[PDB]
Each structure stands twice: as structure tokens, then as C-alpha cells.
Amino acid sequence: ELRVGLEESELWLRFKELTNEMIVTKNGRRMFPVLKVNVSGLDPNAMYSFLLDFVAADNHRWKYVNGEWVPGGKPEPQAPSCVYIHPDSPNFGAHWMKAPVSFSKVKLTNKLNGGGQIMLNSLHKYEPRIHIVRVGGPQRMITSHCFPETQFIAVTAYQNEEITALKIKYN
Numbered sequence: 230e231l232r233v234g235l236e237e238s239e240l241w242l243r244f245k246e247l248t249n250e251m252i253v254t255k256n257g258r259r260m261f262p263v264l265k266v267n268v269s270g271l272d273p274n275a276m277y278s279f280l281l282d283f284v285a286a287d288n289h290r291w292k293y294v295n296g297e298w299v300p301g302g303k304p305e306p307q308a309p310s311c312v313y314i315h316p317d318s319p320n321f322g323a324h325w326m327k328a329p330v331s332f333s334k335v336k337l338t339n340k341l342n343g344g345g346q347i348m349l350n351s352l353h354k355y356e357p358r359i360h361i362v363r364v365g366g367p368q369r370m371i372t373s374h375c376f377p378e379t380q381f382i383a384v385t386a387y388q389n390e391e392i393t394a395l396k397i398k399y400n
């Protein structure tokens with residue numbers, strides 16, 4: 230059975246207990262912490278591409294009101310985010326299983342942009358998700374996995390200084 234684990238869940242959970250925030254910029258900002266995934270149970274010899282996307286966890290706009298995040302009352306449907314291809318893709322199962330798959334080069338933006346960067350809506354909550362796509366073979370297959378521990382709200386600047394302090398402490 231294909232197994233997907235989050236690396237450094239210890240640390241993600243500290244961020245999650247505070248409500249995590251990720252900066253978005255017009256040019257695109259890399260994530261901290263970085264999503265790193267442990268994968269076992271692939272065919273060492275089969276070909277796979279890793280995809281990362283961000284699910285809108287709810288349909289609301291969030292605001293930091295008197296030291297607390299609180300959702301708006303006017304939900305709107307959220308169009309799905311674009312997919313980021315891990316730059317090691319396509320690659321053999323052995324490649325993906327020899328070390329945690331690290332999405333260190335994805336950039337989060339608030340503006341529709343050339344290529345690479347993934348556009349999110351500021352003040353929406355997101356749940357990172359990967360797709361593992363078996364390619365080249367006769368039988369295409371997709372395995373998907375969400376990471377609730379890695380949920381964050383997209384922000385143009387940090388609101389909760391406890392997040393700011395954790396970000397620096399651990400970078």
C-alpha cells in the first residue's frame with residue numbers, strides 16, 4: 230500500500246495550534262515551514278510526478294479581530310488553485326522514496342503571474358494537498374493526500390506576532 234506521511238509534523242502542529250499564516254506577494258513568497266512528505270510503497274521502477282495544490286478549506290474571508298481570527302458572514306464559492314509540479318518530476322519511485330519530497334521552491338502569490346507561482350486569495354484558509362501521478366506506464370493512476378496539520382491563512386503581512394516569532398525561531 231502507498232503510504233504518505235508529513236515530515237516534521239511536531240513543528241507544523243505548533244504553527245497550527247496558533248493558526249498558521251503564509252505570506253503572499255505579487256512576485257511570490259516561498260513557504261515556511263516547507264511541506265516535506267515521506268512516501269513509501271511506490272514501485273521503485275515506475276515513473277511518477279508529484280503535484281501540490283491548495284484546497285480552500287472554507288468559502289469565507291477571515292479577519293484578525295482583537296487578537297483572534299474570525300470568519301466573515303458572506304461566503305463565496307472558491308475556484309480551485311493551480312497545481313505546482315515538483316521540479317524533480319517526472320522521476321522513478323526510488324528517487325521519491327530515498328529522501329522526504331520537499332516543496333521548497335513553490336511560491337505563493339496574490340496576482341495572476343507568468344509561470345511557477347501559485348495564486349491564492351488573501352485572507353482565505355487553505356489545506357495543502359498532493360497528488361502522486363503514475364505517468365509513462367500503460368495504467369495512469371493518481372493518489373491524493375491532504376495535510377490538515379499544514380492548514381494556513383494566506384496574508385500579505387503577519388497578523389499574529391506569535392506566528393512571526395515562531396517563523397523566525399525555527400528558520
Ligand SMILES: CN(C(=O)[C@H]1CC1(C)C)c1cccnc1
Nearest residue numbers: 277278279280314318319362364
Ligand atoms: C513536468 N510534467 C509532468 O510531470 C506531467 C505529467 C504531468 C501532466 C504532471 C509536465 C511537463 C510538460 C507539461 N506539463 C507537465
